[PDB]
Design a protein around this ligand. Structure first.
Ligand SMILES: C[C@H]1O[C@H](O[C@H]2[C@H](O)[C@@H](O)[C@@H](O[C@H]3[C@H](O)[C@@H](O)[C@@H](O)O[C@@H]3CO)O[C@@H]2CO)[C@H](O)[C@@H](O)[C@@H]1N[C@H]1C=C(CO)[C@@H](O[C@H]2O[C@H](CO)[C@@H](O[C@H]3O[C@H](CO)[C@@H](O[C@H]4O[C@H](CO)[C@@H](O)[C@H](O)[C@H]4O)[C@H](O)[C@H]3O)[C@H](O)[C@H]2O)[C@H](O)[C@H]1O
Ligand SMILES: *[C@@H]1O[C@H](CO)[C@@H](O[C@H]2O[C@H](CO)[C@@H](O[C@H]3O[C@H](CO)[C@@H](O[C@H]4O[C@H](CO)[C@@H](O)[C@H](O)[C@H]4O)[C@H](O)[C@H]3O)[C@H](O)[C@H]2O)[C@H](O)[C@H]1O
Ligand SMILES: OC[C@H]1O[C@H](O[C@H]2[C@H](O)[C@@H](O)[C@@H](O[C@H]3[C@H](O)[C@@H](O)[C@H](O)O[C@@H]3CO)O[C@@H]2CO)[C@H](O)[C@@H](O)[C@@H]1O
Lengths: 517, 506
């Protein structure tokens, strides 16, 4: 105590940085974008080569979009199921390594500069099915793992429903489950038993395909972990109407007596559309969900825990307040803001799954409740440099207004590439940006913005692969409020991870400089 | 209620920035550096002109060094008293406004490119005395304010002791109070009464001089406030042995039975000296101070409150642990006592050097901001805390302090490894404007407050350096060149304002 002598080497009693505060960087790249011969990226060789490339840069995070079966436009954010994997990500070459295909069965390569889901489906699906058929017919080690997977209660609580939904959908010629006969529509037990008898093989194959996705995704994840790379997944806030999630959990969505949505999702007039984004997903009956401690949402997060080290929460503002549009409407601009579940949801998640690493996508209309909700759960938010040059110096996306507990992006999958953005940028905004940023040639504008993200105080900086490749507007992943021509971008067939040492070295130099290695 | 509609105005329910988080900037400039004819800067017209200039830039903070009577080398950090003002900062022209001098009594101007304290003393002190004499001899409104000042208990708790110490020091031919005869050394009551009778005039004049400093300083401070400018002072953690503070409060310092120290202050081998800085000040008996709720330190802060909006604490680490030529400091117990006695304070911790865990924890526990200095940022790796990407919000960023060379001076002698680093991190145009590159980097920081020495705004070299640590001669002398007026710095003002606008510090 006060006045007395210290021990010796008091001089070596120095502050030790907290390992959870470690500065880092990463790349945003959806696996559909990998090059290869089967019309779409997959969880095979290119994923592992990408991980190796990423590791060589010093980056320690890979962010993907939702891995759910996408809508027919390719959107991960209107998925056909909330928990299933997109089976067209399954690598045929990896099935050959597993003994479920032979090399001779692999199709002839097709050129596909961009992903066409219908072309990839026709090519891959017969061989995926044939591999699943060999799996369920076999009686050894892999079959034994299939059975563990399917009897595991944290799988079967969603996978059984998904497989029955898919089987009924295969049985019926109908637009959606709204049109289904009453016993199937409302999941009468003897109807489900009848479906099990008449569709037994389809059900066993669907389940086998989910196992194969799981298996291959987990190999990619462990390989990333072996190379010092965390994977950040993405949890879309809404699911599509035509899904097992809505059909099997009707009471938990805002549907009428006949199962039709009263209200659908979106946002009011914004940057991307002067009539708003009319997403058109069904909405959650949050009060009903509260009555069984949000178990559907809890199950979702438990699933995400199993796939990802960390998870982005899409449209995070929607848990404080959400935009609700009448279901008959043709534009989002007529609508009401409604009260979200708030912290009560995250308390339920904590109680059910324990410790989670979540990233709030807090972009959009950010009201006081949104900020307070984010702070109350300790989650980092986002900054996007492409938004930084409207308004004045109080713009939160400007570097000097960044926070430590935050993730900085050059842009997301919703934004144009940096070059594309620069190219159409308003002159007032462009002249601003020239003052803040360190710009050499306009060819390398993407690198100027990348450097600005890396120089930030934000703990994590994430760059889309398109910007590392210096690509233009044609490489944009998604344009919000458009219905066609999205989610198709692929790494050009000529660009290999072997041909990107210059880019790797340049990233590593910037990470070294800004203490992100 | 979950599920319900929100009210109509929901989209406009936007976060309002917290006013206590407001980003700002300022200038470090000691008043001795102002131009003028009397051999030293003062609290007259240049201080007001500087405030007006500073306001036009968008800056909202002015940082000074300690305003105490300095040592004979000019150092504010080995002051002759912890609470008195440096009377050579008194403006003679302001005394003429007050009726205490006439214009005809003012001395002929002397050219002094730098402050010489002996030259300034010989010039100014006789007239300051003559003014103080006219004050104490007068009746009327100014005399009435002198009496209020001296009877105010938050003045007299330090000023009485300071005036008696100075009177005895004037009476005696002695090295220090250690050599004083016992009754004066040890403040025997009948000795102090005797001194009051035999030095009454000196004592009244000393007090009058402190009133005139207070008066002029408070006008400067109220003018700054009217122009939106906060003043940040500074205090050394230690005071010199030969001071009223030690002599009148012996029990509170680490002295033997005869009043001699035993333990003195400093810190080990560092950047500025391979044998360390041996400051040699006496040290606090912290346990004894705890026994009267740290009243000496509390009085000190109360005085700093009176002079400054905010205050830097030099060698803040010394409150967690101090080197005695390592011992346990008083820690948070001291700041709790300050809070209880004075209420809310705005303190800035000088947390520079090799600092230990307890220092960081202490600083965080009282909510005080620490420092980043850009001149230190380019040694070691990317974990260097002075690099912008490692700055914190609750922090004060400097290009450099009064202890560092100017940016141009620093750039000029900089090690090549460090220089090549700095070129990668900073935005540099011409080397002539290296000071502006570093100023821009400070302004772009996430740190809430950025402070730039006036020398760097003027783009000056090593000859304008204020102080070289561990040197005994040639410090504290810099003055703004006689040709540079605040009227003639519009380009510099505009450039600062453009940067503050850009980085949200207006
Ligand atoms: C996209 C993001 O939008 C919101 O934030 C925006 C904000 O609105 C902007 O103003 C701006 O804000 C910034 C300011 O501009 C700036 O000044 C400063 O202040 O900073 C602000 C940032 O804070 O930028 C932000 C961010 O981009 C949201 O708040 C934000 O959460 C959101 N991003 C994520 C959320 C979703 C929603 O799940 C994702 O949406 C995407 O997926 C949708 C669903 O697929 C898609 O909808 C389109 O496509 C549908 C088909 O898939 C289509 O559906 C119809 O047609 C189908 C057949 O064709 C049929 O089956 C359906 O039944 C039909 O309804 C929809 O009509 C169509 O809209 C979205 O377009 C797509 O973006 C995001 O990807 C997430 O990242
Ligand atoms: C933060 O605080 C430090 C506190 O020292 C500031 O340091 C500056 O001011 C110091 C003086 O107050 C300088 O110390 C040097 O000069 C001292 C005397 O001025 C030296 O002390 C020795 O010499 C004096 C003669 O005046 C003797 O009377 C003393 O007994 C004897 O110890 C001292 O050794 C020497 O280091 C220092 O260089 C300055 O940097 C600092 O500026 C603040 O930021
Ligand atoms: O009077 C000057 C101050 O002296 C003490 O702090 C000094 C250090 O002694 C000195 O080593 C140097 O430290 C910096 C170091 O050079 C740099 O590599 C490192 O990254 O940062 C250090 C700063 O935190 O400079 C400081 C500050 O001038 C003393 O502690 C202080 O009270 C005095 O004001």
């Amino acid at each position: 105590s006060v006045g007395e002598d210290f021990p010796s080497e008091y001089e070596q009693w120095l502050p030790v940085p907290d390992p959870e505060s470690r500065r880092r960087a990463g790349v945003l790249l959806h696996p559909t974008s990998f090059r290869g011969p089967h019309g779409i990226g997959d969880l095979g060789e290119e994923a592992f080569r990408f991980i190796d490339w990423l590791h060589s840069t010093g980056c320690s995070v890979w962010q993907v979009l939702p891995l759910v079966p996408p809508d027919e436009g390719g959107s991960p954010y209107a998925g056909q199921d909330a928990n299933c994997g997109n089976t067209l990500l399954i690598s045929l070459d990896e099935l050959v390594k597993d003994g479920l295909l032979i090399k001779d069965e692999l199709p002839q390569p097709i050129d596909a500069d961009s992903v066409n889901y219908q072309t990839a489906n026709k090519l891959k699906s017969p061989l995926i099915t044939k591999a699943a058929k060999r799996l369920i017919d076999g009686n050894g080690e892999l079959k034994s793992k299939l059975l563990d997977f399917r009897n595991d209660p944290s799988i079967s609580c969603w996978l059984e429903d998904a497989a029955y939904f898919a089987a009924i959908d295969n049985t019926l010629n109908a637009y959606s489950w709204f049109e289904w006969p009453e016993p199937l529509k409302n999941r009468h037990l003897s109807a489900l038993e009848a479906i099990y008898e008449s569709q037994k093989e389809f059900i066993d194959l669907f389940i086998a395909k989910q196992f194969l996705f799981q298996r291959q995704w987990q190999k990619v994840r462990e390989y990333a972990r072996r190379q010092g790379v965390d994977i950040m997944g993405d949890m879309p806030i809404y699911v599509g109407y035509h899904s097992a999630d809505v059909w099997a959990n009707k009471k938990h969505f805002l549907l009428n007596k006949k199962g039709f949505p009263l209200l659908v999702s979106g946002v009011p007039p914004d940057l991307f559309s002067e009539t708003g984004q009319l997403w058109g997903s069904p909405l959650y009956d949050w009060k009903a969900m509260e009555s069984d401690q949000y178990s559907w949402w809890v199950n979702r997060i438990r699933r995400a825990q199993d796939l990802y080290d960390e998870c982005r929460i899409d449209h995070f503002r929607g848990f404080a307040g959400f935009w609700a549009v009448p279901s008959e409407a043709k534009v989002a601009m007529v609508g009401r803001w409604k009260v979200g579940p708030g912290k009560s949801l995250f308390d339920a998640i904590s109680k059910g799954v324990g410790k989670i690493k979540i990233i709030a996508e807090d972009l959009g209309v950010i009201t006081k409740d949104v900020v307070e909700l984010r702070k109350s759960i300790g989650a980092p938010g986002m900054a996007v440099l492409q938004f930084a040059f409207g308004g004045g110096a109080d713009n939160p996306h400007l570097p000097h207004n960044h926070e430590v507990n935050q993730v900085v992006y050059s842009g997301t999958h919703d934004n144009d590439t940096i070059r594309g953005w620069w190219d159409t940028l308003d002159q007032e905004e462009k002249s601003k940006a020239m003052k803040y940023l360190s710009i050499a040639g306009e060819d390398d504008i993407s690198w100027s913005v990348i450097q600005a993200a890396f120089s930030s105080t934000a703990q994590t900086a994430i760059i889309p692969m398109q910007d590392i490749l210096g690509l233009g507007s044609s490489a944009r992943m998604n344009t919000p409020a458009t219905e066609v021509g999205n989610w198709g971008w692929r790494i050009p067939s000529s660009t290999s991870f072997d041909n990107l040492e210059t880019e790797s070295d340049r990233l590593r130099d910037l990470l070294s400089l800004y203490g992100r290695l």
